[PDB]
Symmetry: D2
Subunit: 352 residues, 4 copies
């Protein structure tokens, strides 16, 4: 079968691979709709998580089950499924400790396009179908559904990690697709005022649509100073980091009140260190809690997010700015994430 792969750091292309076969608890799935992710640009071009060889890329798919192992009970060939980007091994110590994302090691719940061939292939393999797939309701269109595996779970996790309480004033730094979902997530965890820091007009407009109340752009001066002025010197209660770089944490610390939470979901692609400023972190003692976490996955997380879409709590379709057709256009869509035009949030390729 054909797949679109990281050949090595800095190099992508189409390769031929054996079609995978399922173990007793697994499923083979063919993609119906897929999307590319900024994360794959960090992995391939920055070597952010080390060298790889002929690794099929992609970790955002809606699919059709085509084969199941003998012990799969809840899925059968023909079933349309939402495939989470995180598909843990559920029988590990990390799961017993409450961190399925790190099942088998740090980040190891994230298999596709990290430590396993991803979804940009004629077929792909899902470990533990019954634990790691969700049925797709017919009422949710493919374009919307493909935002669930990663964009929605990750953006919402940013809000979760930021420990948002009812009425909190929140700043989301970074309003690409993840950060837009963090704006939506903050709104769905009861935030009051929501600042969104971004620069591209279309992303700022969609941030308002998802519940941002204040757009903060760099043309009006230092963004920390703008947020301090806007809050009468008080700062914000909670910060979500959904973009930027290793230096964004310093900005979050400077804009946030003592006794607070910074929730990072950005994959940091370069730089040896994240710098936390000593004085503004209260010389070690300001209770400015710092969190940074990989998104939840598995069946239940998907079912929860599916319900949010089904019951019209969140409409992730606004993230999808470009749609193409056909296997060949996986390459086109991927290259769009690399050189992002000013109108891009997320591309989707429909295969069926």
């Amino acid at each position: 079968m054909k797949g679109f792969a990281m050949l090595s750091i800095g190099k992508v292309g189409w390769i031929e691979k054996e079609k995978p076969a399922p173990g007793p608890f697994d499923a083979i799935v063919r993609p119906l709709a897929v999307a590319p992710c900024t994360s794959d640009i960090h992995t391939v071009f920055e070597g952010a998580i080390g060298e790889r060889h002929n690794m099929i890329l992609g970790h955002e798919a809606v699919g059709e089950v085509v084969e199941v192992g003998s012990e799969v009970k809840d899925f059968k060939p023909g079933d349309r499924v939402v495939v989470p980007a995180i598909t843990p091994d559920w029988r590990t110590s990390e799961v017993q400790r409450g961190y399925h994302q790190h099942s088998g090691g740090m980040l190891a719940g994230w298999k596709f396009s990290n430590v396993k061939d991803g979804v940009f292939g004629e077929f792909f393999h899902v470990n533990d179908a019954d634990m790691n797939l969700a049925h797709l309701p017919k009422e949710i269109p493919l374009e919307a559904a493909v935002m669930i595996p990663d964009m929605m779970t990750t953006g919402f996790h940013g809000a979760e990690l930021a420990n948002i309480k009812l009425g909190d004033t929140v700043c989301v730094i970074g309003i690409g697709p993840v950060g837009l979902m963090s704006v939506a997530g903050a709104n769905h965890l009861g935030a009051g005022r929501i600042f969104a820091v971004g620069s591209r007009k279309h992303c700022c407009d969609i941030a308002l649509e998802y519940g941002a109340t204040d757009i903060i752009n760099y043309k009006n001066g230092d963004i920390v100073e703008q947020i301090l002025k806007a809050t009468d010197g008080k700062g914000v209660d909670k910060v979500v980091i959904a973009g930027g770089d290793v230096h964004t944490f310093a900005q979050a610390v400077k804009m946030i009140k003592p006794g607070s939470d910074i929730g990072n979901v950005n994959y940091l692609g370069e730089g040896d260190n994240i710098d936390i400023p000593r004085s503004e972190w209260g010389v070690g003692m300001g209770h400015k809690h710092i969190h940074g976490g990989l998104c939840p996955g598995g069946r239940l997380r998907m079912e929860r997010l599916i319900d949010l879409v089904f019951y019209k709590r969140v409409d992730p379709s606004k993230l999808v700015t470009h749609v193409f057709r056909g296997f060949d256009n996986i390459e086109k869509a991927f290259m769009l994430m690399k050189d992002k035009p000013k109108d891009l949030i997320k591309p989707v390729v429909i295969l069926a």
Copy 2:
């Protein structure tokens, strides 16, 4: 000054009292708008919290500050304010332990119409103005603003106590004004499917507007059996109790999954005991956690909720079904909570 009071158990009427004077940290406030509460019906007619003598009723007001003590810094005469129903003494052990609602004893943060003359007077006294009052933005109409002191804080607290997580299926039992705010709260804390248990047409319609997906009317059969049928025997994830009686807890336990939370905010007016069914509670071991809590108050809670209204997260004006003009209509408005007509949710009295 005139006030509308609990004369003793079973008896209300107009009385004359001395106008209060502030201590150094206090404010005297004149009401601009007030509302009556079901809780005062429990207190007066069921004697649910003991005997009282000539206690001015009411604990829901927006007002104008008319006098402040010498040590008040943040409020001045002329300021329009939202007055929380709960106005704690902030310098107590219970505050140091994190429970301002019980500062000075169980329920003792709730002063107005519990242990102190309430807001149905020409003036009323607010202890610790700087800690208890919040500024009212001019943009919020009086009718909406007077839903903030009690209805919003209490309904939202039901959702908070219910430990709602993203995508949870929630049942709110009781959709009077508090329950309607619990539906809104559940929506704002990331609930997916939301069942609302009620039978009055107008209340049920407003529940849908606040985010209820399913209305459960007891006239169509045992509400527990309806919810189990609707959830294919699985039950709901979390329950808010915002109405009913001491027997409602058993219903909550029977409809909820093991490993779950029941958040009560209903003031229970009668009955020796709340009965929790042994077998359905997992013979002591089902992790069906039971919570019951007085609403938060103080300045910060009010400011948080004012932000939710200001930034258009929640519109509590839908609760207001009757608007009366003039101080004398307090009596008429109160007597409507006693004999609840089917089109009533909450009355408001706007003062001259």
Copy 3:
């Protein structure tokens, strides 16, 4: 093979059963040391969890692995293991939402002597060996080790559920072996003053050894009134219920401060309802949170508690008051839990 079984409600005896065989992920284990539990008295004689027919009793064992399935990686024949009383199916929805105790339904993580033949047999079956067995260090004697599967995990869970904070004043109601572990648990979760409610001299003496500061014997007065007197009317911060009956919760509510937690681990064997007193529960609003939960199990919980014993944090050997040898004494040891002589805390039977 021979096993000691519940024949039906009210009847026990030795029976012959099929020696179990393991699936690919399971182990067959022979007991090296076992103990009987009060819970099996509730199940057999009170019918507390329904009828059973020929169900081998017991759920507290250290064993020797004798056979493993083809997919078991971490355990081999000959390995000495601590077997948790709770051995969940790890691939369920309840596990994905953080409640392994209820995997597959309420209480369903507790298999042995609930929904599966227990450990009082020549052999028994452990589902998912790699997730549900822990290696026994040679330095821990068998008599101590057999307190880990249930007594330590349950008693400690009571303390966990009680949400103990450093310096809290705690009351543990009931000082059988579980309650003695709750006293120890409270001590290792930072309690200051610890009241222990009991009246049997040897249990009271052991309670002092595990950290109780005050013994509360009902013969000296109403236990709630004693605790109120001792705390100058303030009550206790947190309560663990580890014994008593359905009426013990009312005592906990009456002795505890508003804004608090009651952690129940007692298996309630009789009575329709647990009565919560309406007035002393703050008429629905006192923030007296009520918890009741089945003990954790699985491998990781066992390893954690093994560490507590190995590193000399807790010595559970003090619970063991009778040591017998051989299968012939399982029945004797079991009947001691039915008819509790005054010197008894927990018997252990060591097998050849």
Copy 4:
């Protein structure tokens, strides 16, 4: 009156100051025993929190109340009291948000020797006596009692911030007096194995007495690799940072499991930034939560810790390695903290 002061950065000496007078809610206290702190060395010699002019030093005292304001109810002249190092203004927004340590701004609950004349004077001022003093039981000697205001509360807070769960393997980095109390705190919060990182023999011996199981001395090699070797490559569950410098955080991240907590209580005296290593932090996504917080204070915290000492949970007397008498020895004791001889943990000066 005389006091021992920071004259300016790098300079200390005795100065004359006006004897303070109390407001209505305050007390004037004369010290009976005091201790110096490493924090004052950072403040004076490193200029860690900026310039000061004639600020009396010291924030650890047991005292005799000599004067109270007219509104003080619970304290009177003659009363012996434990004075917390943190004495918040309790009537602030930060208190309503649950962070009394930051009442009136970051670190502003810590007044003595930060933003207020400290305890190394003939008298000192305590704001809000009823909220910020605790009675000293006669059964606790002065030397032990003077460990409660800062060493116990801080060290225990490190363990609290580290989110320790029963049986967790913990590493405490730094075993000066605060770190020794973190060891004791970890022990009290249910830790299993406890590593203590330190090299001064007497501190290491005392660490074992407080519950450390393993001493890790940097002279034997990279402490991270020592910990990885000891944990079979698994890392520790939780880390407390109670010493070191800005670079210690990187060590904590490298030794800890994904899905974990680092609780810092070290006052960081120099260095612009705390560097968090990107790769070992899971490229932003490892769930290695970072906390850094000022100790709790006020009356309730002191009463909690007094109970821990009174009921013989923790004996802080082992921290006191040097006792002197008289004001003339405050300077000597202070200079011990700068030049740390090998036998020093904490000095105490008894004044009465």
